[PDB]
Amino acid sequence: SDVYLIFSTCPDLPSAEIISRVLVQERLAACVTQLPGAVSTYRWQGKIETTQEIQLLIKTNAVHVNAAITRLCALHPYRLPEAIAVQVSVGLPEYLTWINTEID
């Protein structure tokens, strides 16, 4: 399908809310789901670091993937945010249509 799920994380609730609201308002994503209480572990210059985060699941389509990612970046606290998109293989047809009609 041409629906894509974009994963990102943000450091807290306002950033998640800002990103979620803006991406939907600007019709770059049909919906954004936040999963709070996430912890991410990564290296930050020779140190194992953990950061509390909100996980985002951004539902969009192929023609909006880049715009959603770049707008996400424009709104993001992080200099280099997670933004990775996975193509949806198949889905409930009316749901895929809804994603598309929301933003196309």
Residue 8: which of 85, 60, 88 has the closest Cα? 85
From CA 63, how far away is CA 14, in angstroms rounded?
27
Tell me the one-letter amino acid at 65. Answer: V
Sign of CA dihedral 11, 84, 38, 71: positive
Method underlying the structure: X-ray
Contacts of 93 (CB under 8 A, 6+ apart): none
To which H or E segment does residue 73 belong?
Answer: helix 62-75
Give this entry's resolution in angstroms.
Answer: 1.4
Q: Which domain holds residue 29?
A: 1-104
Give the count of domains, the chain: 1
For position 68, which CATH number holds? 3.30.70.120
